[PDB]
Design a protein around this nucleic acid. Structure first.
Ligand SMILES: *P(=O)(O)OCC(C)(C)[C@@H](O)C(=O)NCCC(=O)NCCSC(=O)CCCCCCCCCCC
Ligand SMILES: [Mg+2]
Ligand SMILES: [Mg+2]
Ligand SMILES: [Mg+2]
Lengths: 123, 115, 87, 69, 87, 220
RNA sequence: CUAUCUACUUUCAAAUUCCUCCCUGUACGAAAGGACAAGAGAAAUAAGGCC
RNA sequence: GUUCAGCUGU
């Protein structure tokens, strides 16, 4: 009875919930945010809310009392949901919103990202 | 730190923030009972003739020890639903936002530098 | 000013047995080098926690292992402890 | 040809090689996303700009700033 | 006697030395006041009946002070007790 | 030449001396765990701390020291740097257990004991490379005094740095202030202040006693 | 108010509030819907103090 | 002439 809630568990849950484009980024310790960065696409707003609760429902089950509780953010929005567990941050975004922010490039190319090269979204 | 009429600097790459305007962005309302805005506090701005929600990511007023104090009062523009208007933040933002009460994962995700 | 006031519910972080110093949370009324009356907290939450405190008082003459120079609270970072990490 | 046409082609093969050892990231998504950057965003450029894109790709390949699992 | 629910033990008189920062393992800072117990002794005991109160009373004394600046009546009380006068 | 950290020397007041002895004991115990190096206002430091908000991940901030203030366990220093064109200052607590290391990248003294005017100076004077390598300090040599005089930005400044009360010597006033502005500042000059003997605070005897405590702790 | 008179110059210290989490997707609920206190954290205000 | 920008214990 010792299945901890780790990155391997979360990706399993996400794949079980039909995550379209799972992208796990290993954030180095120098970047003082999280150990892992997860960006998942969803078919619709209803899908994002469902898989967001399922991961938090499973986390609450497979967590110690000392471990802090987690809050699902972005419920007011329909396109983008994010859950900051503490060692993993999972961002659930719709396909169109995911392209706009290009979070994969930012967290893999911290200071070399194209948008951070003064290519601002004037659109 | 930030009050009504306080001029603020937009540190995101949003078109609204970076567009040239004769009037500098000014705080018109602070979403706190005391009307005093700190880091991690939402405010309403008068920017380019519009009313846009913003989040305070840095201010000149000294805060607690071990926390960064900035030369300017820095804000990031957010939509009514909490999404950030800009896609990137190049100005260093404090890490205390992560554990401050409220929703800040969206802003932290687009932040290039932490201090 | 110059009147008696009470600060209720101040926790004892640390005790110095050698110098008989009580480290109490926050601030107490009065100037430094003034005499203060210290008493068990009367607040309802802190009622009946004297079960583990010296009763009627602490007698160092009594037969017990001599207390360490400093007594600390479980959460207090002691001066000679290693630098803390939050992992 | 930022530094050489072989370097860009060498980088493209290198990144694709990494995409086939992805434990968690969807390999289909990784390959398509890599294609889009090389095929469209950076295929047609100028001499000076080309160098920045190659340095960006090398930074992505090393993974010191961030790695894709 | 052993401690029983509903018991109220005595307190003490301390001198306020000053304030110091204290840190906890969760990374929070706490300012504390140093209270030093100087020549604190029990001086008098009064039973419930004689005290005109529900609870008995214990009189406690604080810092030692000069005998040359105290009233004769107070000086006579401490003479019987065998302790220097308190502030 | 032996340097006594400024926070050990207490400020004038009615505090019982025992309170300082107790606090100095806690300070010396923390110094055994963490090496606090000798540095001054104007020196470049890199401070490493464990981040509570990032699950204890270590953070490094490099900046010039512009202020050293406080006494006892709470003593602090402010480091200033310009990151991505943004001026940032952090007030660090020397004895905070979060601090993992305090490294002196460059050891020097500036013309002033405080460098708060750097906020009003050109950004270059506050910009230091975060990856700069420590310069070696020659053994048994006097701390070098940097005599740089900074050029200021157009007024108004945060404070009236020209006024005599600040007694600043590291600003090129001639470049930014006219002769009339300089003379107007002298109005606030208080020539008698430097000759007020009763205001003097002599800590020679106090520092000597502190050194005995510092030596005793090292021996044991 | 250059304040003569009346009154008054410590009713000493029981505290309010909004949010987040939790309880809980639990009691109820045909079902949807969805508690209440119990708590936890974070804010602000007020009162009292403190460096 | 305003707005704006700027400064101020208003
Ligand atoms: P061919 O005709 O032999 O050669 C074609 C050439 C190379 C000549 C042509 O493409 C060209 O002129 N290119 C210009 C320079 C160039 O191509 N530079 C390489 C760009 S490197 C690059 O784009 C790296 C991208 C890094 C970010 C990837 C993000 C992936 C996210 C994955 C999420 C799971
Ligand atoms: Mg000012
Ligand atoms: Mg007050
Ligand atoms: Mg104006």
């Amino acid at each position: 009875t010792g299945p901890k809630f780790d990155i391997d568990m979360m990706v399993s849950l996400l794949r079980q919930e039909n995550a379209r484009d799972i992208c796990v980024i290993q954030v180095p310790p120098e970047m003082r945010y999280t150990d892992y960065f997860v960006i998942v696409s969803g078919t619709s707003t209803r899908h994002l809310h469902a898989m967001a609760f399922y991961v938090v429902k499973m986390y609450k089950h497979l967590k110690c009392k000392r471990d802090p509780h987690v809050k699902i953010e972005g419920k007011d929005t329909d396109d983008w949901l994010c859950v900051d567990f503490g060692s993993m941050v999972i961002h659930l975004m719709l396909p169109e919103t995911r392209e706009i922010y290009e979070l994969e490039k930012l967290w893999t190319l911290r200071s070399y990202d194209d948008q951070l090269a003064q290519i601002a979204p004037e659109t | 730190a930030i009050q009504k009429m306080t001029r603020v600097r937009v540190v995101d790459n949003s078109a609204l923030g970076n567009s040239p305007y004769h009037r500098a962005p000014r705080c018109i309302h602070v979403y706190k009972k005391n009307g005093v805005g700190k880091v991690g506090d939402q405010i309403l701005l008068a920017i380019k003739g519009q009313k846009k929600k913003a989040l305070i990511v840095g201010h000149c007023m000294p805060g607690p020890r071990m926390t960064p104090r900035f030369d300017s009062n820095n804000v990031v523009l957010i939509e009514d639903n909490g999404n950030p208007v800009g896609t990137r933040i190049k100005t260093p933002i404090p890490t205390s936002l992560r554990k401050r009460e409220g929703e800040y994962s969206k802003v932290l995700a687009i932040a290039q530098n932490f201090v | 000013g110059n009147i008696y006031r009470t600060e209720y519910g101040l926790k004892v972080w640390r005790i110095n047995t050698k110098h008989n110093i009580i480290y109490v949370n926050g601030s107490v009324p009065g100037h430094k080098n003034c005499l203060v009356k210290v008493k068990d907290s009367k607040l309802p939450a802190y009622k009946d926690l004297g079960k583990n405190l010296p009763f009627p008082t602490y007698f160092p003459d009594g037969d017990e292992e001599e207390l360490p120079e400093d007594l600390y609270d479980e959460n207090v970072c002691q001066p000679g402890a290693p630098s803390i990490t939050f992992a | 040809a930022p530094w050489s046409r072989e370097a860009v082609l060498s980088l493209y093969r290198a990144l694709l090689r990494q995409g086939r050892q992805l434990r968690y990231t969807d390999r289909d998504f990784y390959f398509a996303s890599i294609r889009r950057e090389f095929r469209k965003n950076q295929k047609l450029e100028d001499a000076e700009a080309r160098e920045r894109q190659l340095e960006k790709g090398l930074v992505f390949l090393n993974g010191k700033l961030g790695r894709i699992i | 006697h052993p401690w029983e629910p509903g018991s109220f033990r005595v307190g003490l008189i301390a001198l306020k030395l000053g304030m110091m920062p204290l840190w906890t393992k969760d990374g929070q800072k706490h300012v504390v006041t140093l209270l030093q117990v100087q020549d604190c002794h029990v001086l008098k005991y009064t039973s419930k009946e004689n005290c005109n109160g529900k609870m008995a009373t214990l009189s406690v004394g604080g810092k030692t002070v000069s005998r040359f600046r105290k009233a004769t009546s107070i000086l006579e009380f401490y003479r019987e007790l065998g302790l220097p006068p308190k502030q | 030449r032996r340097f006594l950290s400024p926070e050990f020397i207490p400020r004038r007041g009615r505090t019982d001396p025992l309170k300082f002895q107790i606090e100095r004991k806690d300070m010396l115990e923390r110094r055994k765990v963490l090496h606090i190096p000798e540095f001054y206002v104007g020196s470049i430091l890199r401070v490493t701390t464990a981040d509570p908000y990032a699950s204890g991940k270590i953070s490094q901030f490099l900046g010039i020291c512009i202020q050293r203030s406080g006494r006892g366990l709470g003593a602090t220093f402010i480091l200033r740097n310009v990151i991505e064109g943004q001026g940032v200052e952090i007030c660090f607590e020397l004895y905070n257990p979060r601090v993992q290391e305090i490294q002196v990248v460059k050891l020097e003294k500036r013309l002033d004991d405080s460098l708060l005017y750097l906020r009003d100076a050109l950004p270059e004077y506050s910009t230091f490379d975060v990856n700069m390598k420590p310069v070696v300090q020659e053994p048994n040599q006097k701390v070098p005094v940097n005599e740089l005089k900074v050029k200021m930005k157009p007024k108004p400044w945060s404070k009236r740095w020209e006024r005599p009360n600040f007694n600043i010597k590291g600003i090129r006033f001639d470049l930014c202030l006219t002769e009339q502005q300089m003379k107007e500042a002298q109005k606030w000059n208080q020539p008698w202040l430097e000759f007020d003997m009763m205001r003097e605070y002599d800590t020679s005897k106090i520092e000597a006693a502190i050194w005995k405590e510092i030596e005793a702790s090292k021996r044991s």
